[PDB]
UniProtKB/Swiss-Prot annotation:
Origin organism lineage: Archaea, Thermoproteota, Thermoprotei, Desulfurococcales, Desulfurococcaceae
Annotated protein name in UniProt: Peptide chain release factor subunit 1
Subunit relationships: Heterodimer of two subunits, one of which binds GTP.
HAMAP family: Rel_fact_arch_1
Keyword Cytoplasm: yes
UniProt GO cellular component terms: cytoplasm
Signal peptide start-end: none
Family matches, as Pfam families: eRF1_1 (PF03463), eRF1_2 (PF03464), eRF1_3 (PF03465)
PANTHER family found in the cross-reference section: PEPTIDE CHAIN RELEASE FACTOR SUBUNIT 1
GN (gene name): prf1
Location(s), subcellular: Cytoplasm
GO molecular function, one term: translation release factor activity, codon specific
Source organism (scientific name): Aeropyrum pernix (strain ATCC 700893 / DSM 11879 / JCM 9820 / NBRC 100138 / K1)
Domain of life: Archaea
């Protein structure tokens, strides 16, 4: 029935709580059913899986799976045919059987028992297609990173040995192929899912130009290379940040630059005893009340996060959510309880 369908807005809410689920043994059921797939087929498959469970030497575990399997069968015998976007079920133990139709049509049947729910397919359509890949390249060292909204992370770091120029050239060549392969394995699936919109290549000196001109980078990634190479001095998280801040022509990076610029502006006011900031709940409240706040900075680990968002909607304040991964995030949370405002007066 079409009544089972939920939006991307509800899917994500649910996702935050599905992601919470865990178990010692592989006893949490995940089940995705495409529209093309008759429920009688699924029913036979679950029934087979049910007989197979006797193979589980281990009382509690064996029981656990049977119970979840039965719950899913119960659920399916409530329906006549799969909804138009398919069905997904998660069941297990505190026992529950989540069942719904996703905003997006699923196409690949999937069944699994694990120590957690498999949310894979669902996160991909709850997910803004706004990811940027970043490759920092040096002759003998590299960093591969990923930016989504304000979240920046290191995916992989690599090193090579590189002490006439012939042997050394060949050595650098080998390292660039390793970097190229590593980057491609990490980024190409993202690009294929449509999630990856671009790739920044950065680094000190000439190596990044050499890297880009050669065959190292898969053509799917080459296609969406940001036009301009970015000069950056460092590797690791630090170099990734620098490349993102300096890639001013990439639009998908603005949300991150906004968060960083806001944090720096906030700190500059602090450092210069300017009085152009507010902190402490009572103060932030009163500042908001008279429309005195231009930007509200809120650490994402605050439980009252959304309340301050509402309050900032009206009060006419821009909200910057500070991710836990932001460099100053922990300092911000420790010294200001993860709540502060920059004032317009």
């Amino acid at each position: 029935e079409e009544r089972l369908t939920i939006s991307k807005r509800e899917l994500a809410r649910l996702l935050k709580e599905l992601k919470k689920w865990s178990a010692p043994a592989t006893v949490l059921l995940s089940l995705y059913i495409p529209p093309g797939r008759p429920l009688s087929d699924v029913m036979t498959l679950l029934r087979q899986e049910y007989s197979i469970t006797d193979n589980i030497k281990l009382k509690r575990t064996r029981q656990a799976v049977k119970r979840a399997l039965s719950a899913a069968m119960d659920r399916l015998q409530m329906l006549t045919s799969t909804p138009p976007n398919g069905l997904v079920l998660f069941c297990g133990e505190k026992f529950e059987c989540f069942m719904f139709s996703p905003p997006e049509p699923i196409r690949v049947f999937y069944y699994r028992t694990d120590k957690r729910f498999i949310t894979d397919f669902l996160e991909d359509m709850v997910e803004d297609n706004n990811a940027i890949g970043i490759i920092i390249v040096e002759r003998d060292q590299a960093t591969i990173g990923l930016l989504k909204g304000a979240r920046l992370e290191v995916l992989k770091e690599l090193e090579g040995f590189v002490p006439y120029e012939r042997i050394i050239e060949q050595m650098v060549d080998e390292f660039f192929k390793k970097v190229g392969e590593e980057a491609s394995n990490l980024l190409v699936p993202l690009a294929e899912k449509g999630v990856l919109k671009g790739v920044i290549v950065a680094g000190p000196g000439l190596a990044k130009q050499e890297f880009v001109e050669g065959n190292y980078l898969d053509y799917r990634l080459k296609k969406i290379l940001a036009p301009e190479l970015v000069d950056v001095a460092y590797q690791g998280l630090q170099g990734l940040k620098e490349a993102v801040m300096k890639a001013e022509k990439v639009v998908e990076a603005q949300m991150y630059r906004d968060a960083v610029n806001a944090m720096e502006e906030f700190k500059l006011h602090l450092a210069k005893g300017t009085g152009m900031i507010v902190y402490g709940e009572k103060d932030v409240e009163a500042a908001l009340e008279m429309g005195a706040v231009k930007t509200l900075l809120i650490h994402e680990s605050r439980e009252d996060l959304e309340e301050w968002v509402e309050k900032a909607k009206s009060s006419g304040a821009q909200v910057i959510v500070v991710p836990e991964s932001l460099a100053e995030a922990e300092w911000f949370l420790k010294t200001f309880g993860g709540l502060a405002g920059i004032l317009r007066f």
